[PDB]
Amino acid sequence: NNFVHDCVNITIKQHTVTTTTKG
């Protein structure tokens, strides 16, 4: 949960940098 939570955001990282740039 704690570790994953890191992977999660770590994965969503691009997300935030996705919805904007290069859908």
mmCIF file of C-alpha atoms in Angstrom:
data_model
loop_
_atom_site.group_PDB
_atom_site.id
_atom_site.type_symbol
_atom_site.label_atom_id
_atom_site.label_comp_id
_atom_site.label_asym_id
_atom_site.label_seq_id
_atom_site.Cartn_x
_atom_site.Cartn_y
_atom_site.Cartn_z
ATOM 1 C CA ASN A 1 0.000 0.000 0.000
ATOM 2 C CA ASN A 2 2.742 2.389 1.048
ATOM 3 C CA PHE A 3 5.212 1.082 -1.505
ATOM 4 C CA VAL A 4 2.600 0.827 -4.232
ATOM 5 C CA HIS A 5 1.325 4.295 -3.418
ATOM 6 C CA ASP A 6 4.775 5.330 -4.580
ATOM 7 C CA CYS A 7 4.580 3.308 -7.773
ATOM 8 C CA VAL A 8 1.092 4.655 -8.360
ATOM 9 C CA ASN A 9 2.024 8.323 -8.422
ATOM 10 C CA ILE A 10 5.319 7.297 -9.977
ATOM 11 C CA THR A 11 3.151 5.879 -12.737
ATOM 12 C CA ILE A 12 0.691 8.755 -12.816
ATOM 13 C CA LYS A 13 3.733 10.994 -13.046
ATOM 14 C CA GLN A 14 3.559 10.975 -16.827
ATOM 15 C CA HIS A 15 -0.209 11.205 -16.566
ATOM 16 C CA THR A 16 -0.045 14.798 -15.386
ATOM 17 C CA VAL A 17 2.574 15.302 -18.069
ATOM 18 C CA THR A 18 0.330 13.473 -20.507
ATOM 19 C CA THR A 19 -3.137 14.984 -20.345
ATOM 20 C CA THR A 20 -1.389 18.231 -21.199
ATOM 21 C CA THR A 21 1.419 17.279 -23.550
ATOM 22 C CA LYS A 22 1.014 14.467 -26.051
ATOM 23 C CA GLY A 23 -2.409 13.218 -25.026
#
